[PDB]
Amino acid sequence: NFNVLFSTVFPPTSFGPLVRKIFVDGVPFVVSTGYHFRELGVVHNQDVNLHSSRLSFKELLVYAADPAMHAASGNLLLDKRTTCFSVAALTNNVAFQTVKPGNFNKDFYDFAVSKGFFKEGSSVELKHFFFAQDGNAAISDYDYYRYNLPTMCDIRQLLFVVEVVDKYFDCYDGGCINANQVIVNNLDKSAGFPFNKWGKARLYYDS
Amino acid sequence: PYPDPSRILGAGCFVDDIVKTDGTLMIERFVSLAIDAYPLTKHPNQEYADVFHLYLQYIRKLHDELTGHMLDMYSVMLTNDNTSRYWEPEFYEAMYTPHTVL
Amino acid sequence: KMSDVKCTSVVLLSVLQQLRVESSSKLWAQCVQLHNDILLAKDTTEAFEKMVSLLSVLLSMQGAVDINKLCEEMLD
Amino acid sequence: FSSLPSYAAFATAQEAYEQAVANGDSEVVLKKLKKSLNVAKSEFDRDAAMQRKLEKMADQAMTQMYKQARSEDKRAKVTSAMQTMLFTMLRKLDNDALNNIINNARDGCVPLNIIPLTTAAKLMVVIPDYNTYKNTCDGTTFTYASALWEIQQVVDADSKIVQLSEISMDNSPNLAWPLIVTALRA
Amino acid sequence: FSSLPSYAAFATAQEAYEQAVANGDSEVVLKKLKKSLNVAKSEFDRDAAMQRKLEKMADQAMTQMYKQARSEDKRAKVTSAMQTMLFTMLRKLDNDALNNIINNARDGCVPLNIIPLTTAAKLMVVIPDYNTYKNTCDGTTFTYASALWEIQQVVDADSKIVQLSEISMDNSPNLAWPLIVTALRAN
RNA sequence: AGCUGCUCCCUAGCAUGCUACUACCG
RNA sequence: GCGGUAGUAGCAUGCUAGGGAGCAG
Numbered sequence: 001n002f003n004v005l006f007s008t009v010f011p012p013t014s015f016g017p018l019v020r021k022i023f024v025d026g027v028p029f030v031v032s033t034g035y036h037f038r039e040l041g042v043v044h045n046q047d048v049n050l051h052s053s054r055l056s057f058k059e060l061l062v063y064a065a066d067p068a069m070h071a072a073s074g075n076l077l078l079d080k081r082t083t084c085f086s087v088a089a090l091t092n093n094v095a096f097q098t099v100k101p102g103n104f105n106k107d108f109y110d111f112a113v114s115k116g117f118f119k120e121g122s123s124v125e126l127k128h129f130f131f132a133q134d135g136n137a138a139i140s141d142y143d144y145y146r147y148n149l150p151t152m153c154d155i156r157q158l159l160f161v162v163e164v165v166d167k168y169f170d171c172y173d174g175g176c177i178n179a180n181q182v183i184v185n186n187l188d189k190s191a192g193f194p195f196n197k198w199g200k201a202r203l204y205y206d207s
Numbered sequence: 208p209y210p211d212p213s214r215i216l217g218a219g220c221f222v223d224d225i226v227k228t229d230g231t232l233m234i235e236r237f238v239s240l241a242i243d244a245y246p247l248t249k250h251p252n253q254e255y256a257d258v259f260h261l262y263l264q265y266i267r268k269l270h271d272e273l274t275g276h277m278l279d280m281y282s283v284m285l286t287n288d289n290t291s292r293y294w295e296p297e298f299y300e301a302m303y304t305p306h307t308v309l
Numbered sequence: 310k311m312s313d314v315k316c317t318s319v320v321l322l323s324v325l326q327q328l329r330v331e332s333s334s335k336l337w338a339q340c341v342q343l344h345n346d347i348l349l350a351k352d353t354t355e356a357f358e359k360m361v362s363l364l365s366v367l368l369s370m371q372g373a374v375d376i377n378k379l380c381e382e383m384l385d
Numbered sequence: 386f387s388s389l390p391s392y393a394a395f396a397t398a399q400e401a402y403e404q405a406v407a408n409g410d411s412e413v414v415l416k417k418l419k420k421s422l423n424v425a426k427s428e429f430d431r432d433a434a435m436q437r438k439l440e441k442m443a444d445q446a447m448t449q450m451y452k453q454a455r456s457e458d459k460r461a462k463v464t465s466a467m468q469t470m471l472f473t474m475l476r477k478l479d480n481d482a483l484n485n486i487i488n489n490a491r492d493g494c495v496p497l498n499i500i501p502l503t504t505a506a507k508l509m510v511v512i513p514d515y516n517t518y519k520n521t522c523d524g525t526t527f528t529y530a531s532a533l534w535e536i537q538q539v540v541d542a543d544s545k546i547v548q549l550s551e552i553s554m555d556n557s558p559n560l561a562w563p564l565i566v567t568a569l570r571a
Numbered sequence: 572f573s574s575l576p577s578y579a580a581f582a583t584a585q586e587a588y589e590q591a592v593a594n595g596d597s598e599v600v601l602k603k604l605k606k607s608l609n610v611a612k613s614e615f616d617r618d619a620a621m622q623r624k625l626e627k628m629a630d631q632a633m634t635q636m637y638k639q640a641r642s643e644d645k646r647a648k649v650t651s652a653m654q655t656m657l658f659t660m661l662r663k664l665d666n667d668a669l670n671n672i673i674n675n676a677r678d679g680c681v682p683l684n685i686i687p688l689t690t691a692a693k694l695m696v697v698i699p700d701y702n703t704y705k706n707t708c709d710g711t712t713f714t715y716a717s718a719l720w721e722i723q724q725v726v727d728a729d730s731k732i733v734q735l736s737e738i739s740m741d742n743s744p745n746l747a748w749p750l751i752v753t754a755l756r757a758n
Numbered sequence: 759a760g761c762u763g764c765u766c767c768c769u770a771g772c773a774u775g776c777u778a779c780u781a782c783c784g
Numbered sequence: 785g786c787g788g789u790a791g792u793a794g795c796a797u798g799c800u801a802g803g804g805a806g807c808a809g
């Protein structure tokens with residue numbers, strides 16, 4: 001709670017991952033080794049090793065998900081459409097994504113009109129549709145994070161509310177489980193950047 | 208519980224794929240949408256029960272028009288293997304009565 | 310008669326979309342605005358003038374849909 | 386399914402036992418038909434089952450094939466069905482302004498930009514021959530989309546001004562004809 | 572399933588029963604050669620029903636290890652993909668500006684948000700309207716983030732090249748209007 | 759191109775369970 | 785005459801797996 005108040009004073013380029021240079025068989029990388037949170041302070045990793053020999057499947061998986069080497073090798077970006085902090089541009093051009101209209105099932109509509117629907121003054125009418133969007137739809141929707149502001153709490157009131165709220169959750173039981181006990185519905189969904197260049201979640205749960 | 212009638216009718220008229228604009232290819236979409244619309248039959252407003260009745264009539268029409276294709280374009284005689292339960296109200300009334308079958 | 314104008318607007322925007330109109334960003338923006346404002350109208354005198362201006366777009370692109378045989382296939 | 390081989394055997398056994406119960410002599414000489422017969426129902430119900438559900442399996446395979454064929458041939462014809470649909474729907478709407486602009490476009494007069502709605506703002510229309518110029522433009526007032534527009538400037542296909550009273554019958558074969566009128570809404 | 576050890580045995584039992592049926596002598600003819608047949612019952616039940624289970628289990632096993640071989644190949648494929656990507660983005664990175672800022676850090680660590688801000692060679696700006704254009708990057712060189720930049724190329728929302736003379740207050744309504752400016756760091 | 763929950767339809771399989779016919783021994 | 789087991793056929797209930805679809809946050 002105190003960190004939230006004190007962190008509004010310091011420059012916003014000082015928060016985020018902290019990077020370092022390591023060597024993989026004599027070739028230098030740039031990887032994350034910590035984090036500076038606005039709420040939790042400075043955190044340092046416990047297993048960091050310069051000069052490793054190879055990379056397993058797991059270490060490649062961890063280095064590919066890191067934003068360190070994606071952002072350290074792109075262009076600088078000054079996006080003036082938002083007030084949010086922009087970091088880097090990962091290509092040479094901007095992408096403008098649209099949304100399409102719906103499809104009209106004319107057979108059902110004709111059948112329904114031959115049974116007396118959609119008359120003048122009826123109580124049932126059409127108000128649900130597929131609305132279309134133009135190229136500036138994604139960034140204008142991302143710009144709604146300007147409503148998130150730093151909020152400091154009444155701490156002595158919160159430390160009591162949390163106990164009562166915890167009393168609401170007493171009948172359940174939890175804990176950790178192993179990898180052969182977890183259940184996935186629909187292993188045919190996306191894996192999410194950069195992993196959607198090579199397969200779906202099935203590929204990574206099988207490999 | 209019952210839904211807004213405009214939601215069900217809109218799910219009938221507007222779709223997100225061109226294949227779903229032919230009814231005889233799926234039919235199950237309309238069976239599910241008719242499950243969702245059964246409790247409107249008990250409403251005091253008469254233009255609300257007509258939605259459930261319209262769905263049942265459309266399901267029957269689609270079944271007939273699918274079966275009357277295999278007898279002409281081909282020479283296949285389809286038998287009504289108890290597919291007549293879908294255009295009667297008992298199959299749908301059973302989903303809101305307390306004795307499960309999930 | 311409001312229902313018909315709304316359904317026709319949906320079909321119109323589908324035709325315009327598959328005629329490769331979103332390769333011009335300003336034209337596509339105007340078309341999307343007209344479509345979305347027809348779908349929200351509550352007065353059948355605005356919807357028809359907006360439909361007039363939205364069909365003018367397809368009629369501008371001469372040499373992309375052949376207007377004659379379509380109007381003579383059976384229906385106008 | 387009765388045209389099957391073991392039908393004859395089963396029918397023979399059951400007719401023999403019908404005779405045996407209509408004669409009623411022994412208990413195991415009549416059990417002959419039953420030691421003899423339960424074999425008939427062990428080789429007729431064992432063969433009047435597999436083909437009976439095979440009859441349904443075949444019909445369900447052919448319905449699946451038909452559905453895949455129809456599904457794949459529906460999405461190879463989107464941009465002909467869509468335009469045919471649009472024009473039937475526009476015909477049954479039966480609006481005066483839409484019919485005006487559609488008939489004009491069918492005979493040659495098309496716009497060059499979106500039709501404006503404000504009482505200000507400009508409209509440009511291509512006019513391809515004298516005959517279609519008679520019906521719409523008379524004086525300095527234009528009749529289009531069931532409205533009235535006031536002419537401001539006419540230029541030729543040579544991109545040079547032509548004064549308005551020049552356009553008439555005799556001088557029509559003197560101008561590269563696809564002119565462009567420019568009008569503002571009244 | 573005909574080359575089993577008991578096909579011959581049930582065959583000879585029924586063949587002797589056929590021989591005696593062509594004979595038809597005694598009550599023991601019936602009893603015996605329905606029990607020569609009624610012994611060759613277990614043969615052709617277990618030897619033709621345990622042979623009907625081992626084969627299903629063998630097919631199960633073969634299909635399963637087919638699956639495992641394919642899953643083992645796709646793993647190597649994706650491993651190669653990830654390695655090539657990492658080593659490819661490695662070679663736009665190892666400059667001297669990077670080492671210069673890294674060696675000025677007291678313990679080796681730096682924030683990640685200041686690496687493109689201080690070492691990148693190219694800048695991209697996205698402009699919503701002309702009023703913003705006048706206040707950010709008018710001219711042919713401008714200063715951003717404590718450095719000097721030099722414009723090369725301007726494109727619009729359709730990815731078409733604009734020339735710097737067209738961008739004006741009265742030509743503004745004729746442009747597709749997010750413009751994207753590309754500049755290079757001046758030395 | 760996400761995370762969850764519920765419901766309908768179709769096929770495969772497993773054991774189980776009920777039920778019917780044949781054989782053997784007791 | 786009955787029991788036990790071994791086979792073969794038909795029927796239900798439950799569980800798992802796979803595919804198709806619908807709604808809600």
Ligand SMILES: [Zn+2]
Nearest residue numbers: 174175176177
């Ligand atoms: Zn734990």
